[PDB]
PDB file of C-alpha atoms in Angstrom:
ATOM      1  CA  UNK A   1       0.142  -0.173   0.160  1.00  0.00           C
ATOM      2  CA  UNK A   2       1.375   3.418   0.906  1.00  0.00           C
ATOM      3  CA  UNK A   3       1.996   2.080   4.861  1.00  0.00           C
ATOM      4  CA  UNK A   4       2.605  -1.574   3.350  1.00  0.00           C
ATOM      5  CA  UNK A   5       5.306  -0.244   0.738  1.00  0.00           C
ATOM      6  CA  UNK A   6       6.949   2.187   3.191  1.00  0.00           C
ATOM      7  CA  UNK A   7       7.260  -0.555   5.792  1.00  0.00           C
ATOM      8  CA  UNK A   8       8.980  -2.712   3.531  1.00  0.00           C
ATOM      9  CA  UNK A   9      11.283  -0.542   2.353  1.00  0.00           C
ATOM     10  CA  UNK A  10      12.338   0.567   6.202  1.00  0.00           C
ATOM     11  CA  UNK A  11      12.796  -3.131   6.945  1.00  0.00           C
ATOM     12  CA  UNK A  12      15.396  -3.803   3.994  1.00  0.00           C
ATOM     13  CA  UNK A  13      17.124  -0.434   5.222  1.00  0.00           C
ATOM     14  CA  UNK A  14      17.431  -1.599   8.915  1.00  0.00           C
ATOM     15  CA  UNK A  15      20.784  -1.963  10.891  1.00  0.00           C
ATOM     16  CA  UNK A  16      18.781  -4.414  13.209  1.00  0.00           C
ATOM     17  CA  UNK A  17      20.100  -3.896  16.843  1.00  0.00           C
ATOM     18  CA  UNK A  18      19.094  -5.871  20.324  1.00  0.00           C
ATOM     19  CA  UNK A  19      16.243  -4.213  22.241  1.00  0.00           C
ATOM     20  CA  UNK A  20      24.270  -8.303  24.563  1.00  0.00           C
ATOM     21  CA  UNK A  21      25.864 -11.884  24.814  1.00  0.00           C
ATOM     22  CA  UNK A  22      26.835 -14.700  22.173  1.00  0.00           C
ATOM     23  CA  UNK A  23      23.141 -16.122  22.515  1.00  0.00           C
ATOM     24  CA  UNK A  24      21.328 -12.561  22.036  1.00  0.00           C
ATOM     25  CA  UNK A  25      23.439 -11.895  19.033  1.00  0.00           C
ATOM     26  CA  UNK A  26      22.962 -15.509  17.343  1.00  0.00           C
ATOM     27  CA  UNK A  27      19.005 -14.676  18.053  1.00  0.00           C
ATOM     28  CA  UNK A  28      19.617 -11.263  16.467  1.00  0.00           C
ATOM     29  CA  UNK A  29      20.845 -12.849  13.245  1.00  0.00           C
ATOM     30  CA  UNK A  30      18.041 -15.153  12.939  1.00  0.00           C
ATOM     31  CA  UNK A  31      15.779 -12.053  13.390  1.00  0.00           C
ATOM     32  CA  UNK A  32      17.661 -10.404  10.359  1.00  0.00           C
ATOM     33  CA  UNK A  33      16.159 -13.176   8.230  1.00  0.00           C
ATOM     34  CA  UNK A  34      12.404 -12.480   8.172  1.00  0.00           C
ATOM     35  CA  UNK A  35       9.504 -13.951   6.403  1.00  0.00           C
ATOM     36  CA  UNK A  36       9.411 -10.764   3.764  1.00  0.00           C
ATOM     37  CA  UNK A  37      13.117 -10.609   3.346  1.00  0.00           C
ATOM     38  CA  UNK A  38      16.405  -9.625   5.011  1.00  0.00           C
ATOM     39  CA  UNK A  39      17.316  -6.253   6.790  1.00  0.00           C
ATOM     40  CA  UNK A  40      20.275  -4.669   5.408  1.00  0.00           C
ATOM     41  CA  UNK A  41      22.449  -5.191   8.642  1.00  0.00           C
ATOM     42  CA  UNK A  42      22.744  -5.753  12.212  1.00  0.00           C
ATOM     43  CA  UNK A  43      24.053  -3.547  14.992  1.00  0.00           C
ATOM     44  CA  UNK A  44      26.295  -5.271  17.567  1.00  0.00           C
ATOM     45  CA  UNK A  45      29.436  -4.331  19.749  1.00  0.00           C
ATOM     46  CA  UNK A  46      32.574  -4.986  18.291  1.00  0.00           C
ATOM     47  CA  UNK A  47      33.585  -8.415  19.903  1.00  0.00           C
ATOM     48  CA  UNK A  48      30.342 -10.159  18.499  1.00  0.00           C
ATOM     49  CA  UNK A  49      31.395  -9.360  14.948  1.00  0.00           C
ATOM     50  CA  UNK A  50      33.000 -12.775  14.156  1.00  0.00           C
ATOM     51  CA  UNK A  51      30.610 -14.808  15.918  1.00  0.00           C
ATOM     52  CA  UNK A  52      27.850 -12.716  14.186  1.00  0.00           C
ATOM     53  CA  UNK A  53      29.483 -13.392  10.432  1.00  0.00           C
ATOM     54  CA  UNK A  54      29.732 -17.047  11.086  1.00  0.00           C
ATOM     55  CA  UNK A  55      25.812 -16.822  12.249  1.00  0.00           C
ATOM     56  CA  UNK A  56      25.104 -15.159   9.110  1.00  0.00           C
ATOM     57  CA  UNK A  57      26.807 -17.337   6.710  1.00  0.00           C
ATOM     58  CA  UNK A  58      25.556 -20.529   8.163  1.00  0.00           C
ATOM     59  CA  UNK A  59      21.644 -19.439   7.892  1.00  0.00           C
ATOM     60  CA  UNK A  60      22.490 -18.885   4.323  1.00  0.00           C
ATOM     61  CA  UNK A  61      22.254 -14.612   4.412  1.00  0.00           C
ATOM     62  CA  UNK A  62      25.861 -13.730   4.503  1.00  0.00           C
ATOM     63  CA  UNK A  63      24.674 -10.326   2.484  1.00  0.00           C
ATOM     64  CA  UNK A  64      23.603  -9.098   5.773  1.00  0.00           C
ATOM     65  CA  UNK A  65      26.071  -6.683   6.736  1.00  0.00           C
ATOM     66  CA  UNK A  66      27.535  -5.822  10.173  1.00  0.00           C
ATOM     67  CA  UNK A  67      27.929  -2.325  11.976  1.00  0.00           C
ATOM     68  CA  UNK A  68      29.171  -1.584  15.219  1.00  0.00           C
ATOM     69  CA  UNK A  69      30.142   1.741  17.396  1.00  0.00           C
ATOM     70  CA  UNK A  70      33.353   3.297  18.610  1.00  0.00           C
ATOM     71  CA  UNK A  71      33.419   6.283  20.988  1.00  0.00           C
ATOM     72  CA  UNK A  72      30.126   5.007  21.939  1.00  0.00           C
ATOM     73  CA  UNK A  73      28.021   5.891  23.545  1.00  0.00           C
ATOM     74  CA  UNK A  74      29.720   8.627  25.204  1.00  0.00           C
ATOM     75  CA  UNK A  75      31.313  10.779  22.339  1.00  0.00           C
ATOM     76  CA  UNK A  76      34.435  11.846  24.354  1.00  0.00           C
ATOM     77  CA  UNK A  77      37.063  14.056  22.838  1.00  0.00           C
ATOM     78  CA  UNK A  78      39.958  11.639  22.997  1.00  0.00           C
ATOM     79  CA  UNK A  79      41.004  10.952  19.372  1.00  0.00           C
ATOM     80  CA  UNK A  80      43.579   8.470  20.149  1.00  0.00           C
ATOM     81  CA  UNK A  81      41.043   6.307  21.959  1.00  0.00           C
ATOM     82  CA  UNK A  82      38.347   6.687  19.209  1.00  0.00           C
ATOM     83  CA  UNK A  83      40.635   5.773  16.516  1.00  0.00           C
ATOM     84  CA  UNK A  84      42.274   2.584  18.416  1.00  0.00           C
ATOM     85  CA  UNK A  85      38.527   1.714  18.897  1.00  0.00           C
ATOM     86  CA  UNK A  86      38.027   1.864  14.752  1.00  0.00           C
ATOM     87  CA  UNK A  87      41.020   0.137  14.075  1.00  0.00           C
ATOM     88  CA  UNK A  88      39.977  -2.812  16.342  1.00  0.00           C
ATOM     89  CA  UNK A  89      36.392  -2.749  15.042  1.00  0.00           C
ATOM     90  CA  UNK A  90      38.090  -3.028  11.266  1.00  0.00           C
ATOM     91  CA  UNK A  91      40.075  -5.620  12.482  1.00  0.00           C
ATOM     92  CA  UNK A  92      37.494  -7.579  13.866  1.00  0.00           C
ATOM     93  CA  UNK A  93      35.973  -7.316  10.149  1.00  0.00           C
ATOM     94  CA  UNK A  94      33.165  -4.573  10.478  1.00  0.00           C
ATOM     95  CA  UNK A  95      31.368  -3.684   7.493  1.00  0.00           C
ATOM     96  CA  UNK A  96      30.420  -0.365   8.933  1.00  0.00           C
ATOM     97  CA  UNK A  97      31.255   1.950  11.916  1.00  0.00           C
ATOM     98  CA  UNK A  98      29.197   4.244  13.629  1.00  0.00           C
ATOM     99  CA  UNK A  99      31.780   6.557  15.552  1.00  0.00           C
ATOM    100  CA  UNK A 100      30.105   8.945  18.103  1.00  0.00           C
ATOM    101  CA  UNK A 101      30.464  12.630  17.426  1.00  0.00           C
ATOM    102  CA  UNK A 102      32.585  14.631  20.255  1.00  0.00           C
ATOM    103  CA  UNK A 103      29.161  16.791  20.877  1.00  0.00           C
ATOM    104  CA  UNK A 104      29.933  17.895  24.509  1.00  0.00           C
ATOM    105  CA  UNK A 105      32.902  19.493  23.228  1.00  0.00           C
ATOM    106  CA  UNK A 106      31.046  20.834  20.469  1.00  0.00           C
ATOM    107  CA  UNK A 107      28.516  22.277  23.002  1.00  0.00           C
ATOM    108  CA  UNK A 108      31.462  23.523  24.977  1.00  0.00           C
ATOM    109  CA  UNK A 109      32.434  25.602  21.840  1.00  0.00           C
ATOM    110  CA  UNK A 110      35.264  23.345  20.404  1.00  0.00           C
ATOM    111  CA  UNK A 111      34.272  22.739  16.893  1.00  0.00           C
ATOM    112  CA  UNK A 112      37.864  21.765  15.754  1.00  0.00           C
ATOM    113  CA  UNK A 113      38.198  18.504  17.767  1.00  0.00           C
ATOM    114  CA  UNK A 114      34.784  17.039  16.134  1.00  0.00           C
ATOM    115  CA  UNK A 115      36.711  17.411  12.849  1.00  0.00           C
ATOM    116  CA  UNK A 116      39.905  16.099  13.781  1.00  0.00           C
ATOM    117  CA  UNK A 117      38.382  12.951  15.414  1.00  0.00           C
ATOM    118  CA  UNK A 118      36.091  12.221  12.753  1.00  0.00           C
ATOM    119  CA  UNK A 119      38.454  12.533   9.951  1.00  0.00           C
ATOM    120  CA  UNK A 120      41.079  10.465  11.803  1.00  0.00           C
ATOM    121  CA  UNK A 121      38.654   7.510  11.845  1.00  0.00           C
ATOM    122  CA  UNK A 122      37.245   8.110   8.063  1.00  0.00           C
ATOM    123  CA  UNK A 123      41.033   7.945   6.943  1.00  0.00           C
ATOM    124  CA  UNK A 124      41.252   4.358   8.771  1.00  0.00           C
ATOM    125  CA  UNK A 125      37.763   3.154   7.572  1.00  0.00           C
ATOM    126  CA  UNK A 126      38.483   4.404   3.940  1.00  0.00           C
ATOM    127  CA  UNK A 127      41.707   2.227   4.048  1.00  0.00           C
ATOM    128  CA  UNK A 128      39.903  -0.502   4.898  1.00  0.00           C
ATOM    129  CA  UNK A 129      36.942  -0.183   2.494  1.00  0.00           C
ATOM    130  CA  UNK A 130      34.696   0.149   5.510  1.00  0.00           C
ATOM    131  CA  UNK A 131      31.992   2.701   5.959  1.00  0.00           C
ATOM    132  CA  UNK A 132      31.758   5.678   8.555  1.00  0.00           C
ATOM    133  CA  UNK A 133      28.864   6.591  10.203  1.00  0.00           C
ATOM    134  CA  UNK A 134      28.714   9.632  12.564  1.00  0.00           C
ATOM    135  CA  UNK A 135      26.619   9.708  15.344  1.00  0.00           C
ATOM    136  CA  UNK A 136      26.098  13.561  16.391  1.00  0.00           C
ATOM    137  CA  UNK A 137      23.416  12.513  19.505  1.00  0.00           C
ATOM    138  CA  UNK A 138      20.739  15.290  18.424  1.00  0.00           C
ATOM    139  CA  UNK A 139      18.746  14.660  21.824  1.00  0.00           C
ATOM    140  CA  UNK A 140      21.706  16.102  23.982  1.00  0.00           C
ATOM    141  CA  UNK A 141      22.699  18.817  21.138  1.00  0.00           C
ATOM    142  CA  UNK A 142      18.787  20.049  21.227  1.00  0.00           C
ATOM    143  CA  UNK A 143      19.591  23.275  19.566  1.00  0.00           C
ATOM    144  CA  UNK A 144      19.022  23.588  15.833  1.00  0.00           C
ATOM    145  CA  UNK A 145      21.919  25.530  15.193  1.00  0.00           C
ATOM    146  CA  UNK A 146      23.932  22.685  17.194  1.00  0.00           C
ATOM    147  CA  UNK A 147      22.423  20.170  15.115  1.00  0.00           C
ATOM    148  CA  UNK A 148      23.471  21.744  11.938  1.00  0.00           C
ATOM    149  CA  UNK A 149      27.067  22.630  12.895  1.00  0.00           C
ATOM    150  CA  UNK A 150      27.635  18.983  14.083  1.00  0.00           C
ATOM    151  CA  UNK A 151      26.047  17.687  10.748  1.00  0.00           C
ATOM    152  CA  UNK A 152      28.316  20.004   8.825  1.00  0.00           C
ATOM    153  CA  UNK A 153      31.407  19.490  10.590  1.00  0.00           C
ATOM    154  CA  UNK A 154      30.864  15.446  10.374  1.00  0.00           C
ATOM    155  CA  UNK A 155      30.138  15.858   6.750  1.00  0.00           C
ATOM    156  CA  UNK A 156      33.430  17.927   5.952  1.00  0.00           C
ATOM    157  CA  UNK A 157      35.604  15.660   8.050  1.00  0.00           C
ATOM    158  CA  UNK A 158      34.394  12.811   5.566  1.00  0.00           C
ATOM    159  CA  UNK A 159      31.126  10.952   7.370  1.00  0.00           C
ATOM    160  CA  UNK A 160      29.715   8.787   4.866  1.00  0.00           C
ATOM    161  CA  UNK A 161      26.090   8.794   6.679  1.00  0.00           C
ATOM    162  CA  UNK A 162      25.197  11.114   9.760  1.00  0.00           C
ATOM    163  CA  UNK A 163      22.915   9.525  12.592  1.00  0.00           C
ATOM    164  CA  UNK A 164      20.807  11.073  15.035  1.00  0.00           C
ATOM    165  CA  UNK A 165      21.605   9.068  18.235  1.00  0.00           C
ATOM    166  CA  UNK A 166      23.231   6.489  19.850  1.00  0.00           C
ATOM    167  CA  UNK A 167      20.011   4.967  21.083  1.00  0.00           C
ATOM    168  CA  UNK A 168      21.783   5.331  24.632  1.00  0.00           C
ATOM    169  CA  UNK A 169      20.237   8.761  25.877  1.00  0.00           C
ATOM    170  CA  UNK A 170      16.623   9.396  26.730  1.00  0.00           C
ATOM    171  CA  UNK A 171      15.958  11.355  23.432  1.00  0.00           C
ATOM    172  CA  UNK A 172      16.561   9.884  19.982  1.00  0.00           C
ATOM    173  CA  UNK A 173      15.284  10.953  16.479  1.00  0.00           C
ATOM    174  CA  UNK A 174      12.690  13.349  15.994  1.00  0.00           C
ATOM    175  CA  UNK A 175      10.989  14.256  12.643  1.00  0.00           C
ATOM    176  CA  UNK A 176      12.396  17.504  13.248  1.00  0.00           C
ATOM    177  CA  UNK A 177      16.039  16.747  14.074  1.00  0.00           C
ATOM    178  CA  UNK A 178      15.862  14.120  11.047  1.00  0.00           C
ATOM    179  CA  UNK A 179      14.601  17.267   8.837  1.00  0.00           C
ATOM    180  CA  UNK A 180      17.349  19.401  10.056  1.00  0.00           C
ATOM    181  CA  UNK A 181      20.163  16.947   9.271  1.00  0.00           C
ATOM    182  CA  UNK A 182      18.919  16.151   5.526  1.00  0.00           C
ATOM    183  CA  UNK A 183      18.424  19.883   5.055  1.00  0.00           C
ATOM    184  CA  UNK A 184      22.225  20.060   5.656  1.00  0.00           C
ATOM    185  CA  UNK A 185      23.094  17.184   3.497  1.00  0.00           C
ATOM    186  CA  UNK A 186      21.074  18.862   0.796  1.00  0.00           C
ATOM    187  CA  UNK A 187      22.496  22.542   1.524  1.00  0.00           C
ATOM    188  CA  UNK A 188      25.943  21.390   1.125  1.00  0.00           C
ATOM    189  CA  UNK A 189      25.038  19.327  -1.768  1.00  0.00           C
ATOM    190  CA  UNK A 190      26.481  16.007  -0.433  1.00  0.00           C
ATOM    191  CA  UNK A 191      23.294  13.895  -1.373  1.00  0.00           C
ATOM    192  CA  UNK A 192      25.297  11.393  -3.326  1.00  0.00           C
ATOM    193  CA  UNK A 193      28.014  10.884  -0.739  1.00  0.00           C
ATOM    194  CA  UNK A 194      26.234  11.295   2.680  1.00  0.00           C
ATOM    195  CA  UNK A 195      23.355   9.549   3.887  1.00  0.00           C
ATOM    196  CA  UNK A 196      21.112   9.875   6.767  1.00  0.00           C
ATOM    197  CA  UNK A 197      20.339   7.677   9.980  1.00  0.00           C
ATOM    198  CA  UNK A 198      17.252   8.010  12.128  1.00  0.00           C
ATOM    199  CA  UNK A 199      18.056   6.012  15.370  1.00  0.00           C
ATOM    200  CA  UNK A 200      16.835   5.617  18.864  1.00  0.00           C
ATOM    201  CA  UNK A 201      13.299   5.376  19.704  1.00  0.00           C
ATOM    202  CA  UNK A 202      12.072   4.660  16.203  1.00  0.00           C
ATOM    203  CA  UNK A 203       9.609   2.190  17.075  1.00  0.00           C
ATOM    204  CA  UNK A 204       6.361   2.107  14.778  1.00  0.00           C
ATOM    205  CA  UNK A 205       5.555   1.494  10.967  1.00  0.00           C
ATOM    206  CA  UNK A 206       3.918   5.073  10.839  1.00  0.00           C
ATOM    207  CA  UNK A 207       7.175   6.479  12.498  1.00  0.00           C
ATOM    208  CA  UNK A 208       9.197   4.749   9.771  1.00  0.00           C
ATOM    209  CA  UNK A 209       7.246   5.855   6.980  1.00  0.00           C
ATOM    210  CA  UNK A 210       7.688   9.837   8.135  1.00  0.00           C
ATOM    211  CA  UNK A 211      11.060   9.679   8.239  1.00  0.00           C
ATOM    212  CA  UNK A 212      11.262   8.161   4.725  1.00  0.00           C
ATOM    213  CA  UNK A 213       8.458  10.491   4.133  1.00  0.00           C
ATOM    214  CA  UNK A 214      10.865  13.483   4.500  1.00  0.00           C
ATOM    215  CA  UNK A 215      13.838  11.979   2.404  1.00  0.00           C
ATOM    216  CA  UNK A 216      11.448  11.231  -0.558  1.00  0.00           C
ATOM    217  CA  UNK A 217      10.312  15.190  -0.318  1.00  0.00           C
ATOM    218  CA  UNK A 218      13.929  16.619  -0.319  1.00  0.00           C
ATOM    219  CA  UNK A 219      15.936  14.372  -2.375  1.00  0.00           C
ATOM    220  CA  UNK A 220      13.396  12.317  -4.480  1.00  0.00           C
ATOM    221  CA  UNK A 221      11.836   8.982  -4.123  1.00  0.00           C
ATOM    222  CA  UNK A 222      14.850   6.856  -5.520  1.00  0.00           C
ATOM    223  CA  UNK A 223      17.708   8.565  -3.109  1.00  0.00           C
ATOM    224  CA  UNK A 224      16.936   6.519   0.102  1.00  0.00           C
ATOM    225  CA  UNK A 225      18.637   3.188  -0.889  1.00  0.00           C
ATOM    226  CA  UNK A 226      20.721   1.170   1.292  1.00  0.00           C
ATOM    227  CA  UNK A 227      23.671   3.378   1.006  1.00  0.00           C
ATOM    228  CA  UNK A 228      22.227   6.773   1.331  1.00  0.00           C
ATOM    229  CA  UNK A 229      19.638   5.333   4.322  1.00  0.00           C
ATOM    230  CA  UNK A 230      19.285   3.053   7.143  1.00  0.00           C
ATOM    231  CA  UNK A 231      17.048   2.610  10.499  1.00  0.00           C
ATOM    232  CA  UNK A 232      18.922   2.191  13.623  1.00  0.00           C
ATOM    233  CA  UNK A 233      16.502   0.232  15.598  1.00  0.00           C
ATOM    234  CA  UNK A 234      15.323  -3.213  16.987  1.00  0.00           C
ATOM    235  CA  UNK A 235      11.540  -3.434  18.118  1.00  0.00           C
ATOM    236  CA  UNK A 236      10.485  -1.421  15.074  1.00  0.00           C
ATOM    237  CA  UNK A 237      10.937  -4.796  13.153  1.00  0.00           C
ATOM    238  CA  UNK A 238       8.139  -6.300  14.987  1.00  0.00           C
ATOM    239  CA  UNK A 239       5.858  -3.482  14.259  1.00  0.00           C
ATOM    240  CA  UNK A 240       6.921  -3.235  10.435  1.00  0.00           C
ATOM    241  CA  UNK A 241       6.151  -6.986   9.958  1.00  0.00           C
ATOM    242  CA  UNK A 242       2.743  -6.368  11.532  1.00  0.00           C
ATOM    243  CA  UNK A 243       1.964  -3.602   9.196  1.00  0.00           C
ATOM    244  CA  UNK A 244       2.841  -6.323   6.635  1.00  0.00           C
ATOM    245  CA  UNK A 245       0.392  -9.037   7.748  1.00  0.00           C
ATOM    246  CA  UNK A 246       3.423 -10.899   9.577  1.00  0.00           C
ATOM    247  CA  UNK A 247       3.050 -11.473  13.562  1.00  0.00           C
TER     248      UNK A 247
END
């Protein structure tokens, strides 16, 4: 339908996370293989990547990619630590790394560290053919102008995607935050090279439809492919499947 069609689209764009142990990671890998298709990826801590890879292979869905997190969830301003975590995530075999932007440093007026941090990690990721997402933590930034600025620095420092949230603070994505961040991608004209990810608290099919509806409006209905769009979510999946007449 419109709702059915947007729900299947969002399911396929999902980076499925846990709502974390070996047993829970194994079950997540199974969960990502649904009655209506496979999610794009799973989202797990770095140490679970080799076991998750093995699990996906043996269920016959090796095309499910593996995303992980670094500088996470805190978004500290220590570059050596964020970069060392990113090297390890790559070494473990990550398809993508989501680094947390040093957003508290930006709130305190330091724009420069966010740039240096993100770019250091981007350089490591690019060499390994691994994607870098940058989580800016919109729920803590709050202010539209901080939101835009964090998105802009991230983009200049080489972010492959910009992400609203860690899922680890109270406030995650909103339609408003999502629009601000996508407006920045448009204003900078970086549509082709920078994707967008709403994450944290995206729980319903109708919620996912709205976020996707924003992107079709700004960029055209073809833009939000797996490269340029993901849902960082967990329980969303059950909602998506319900809307599709499953469960």
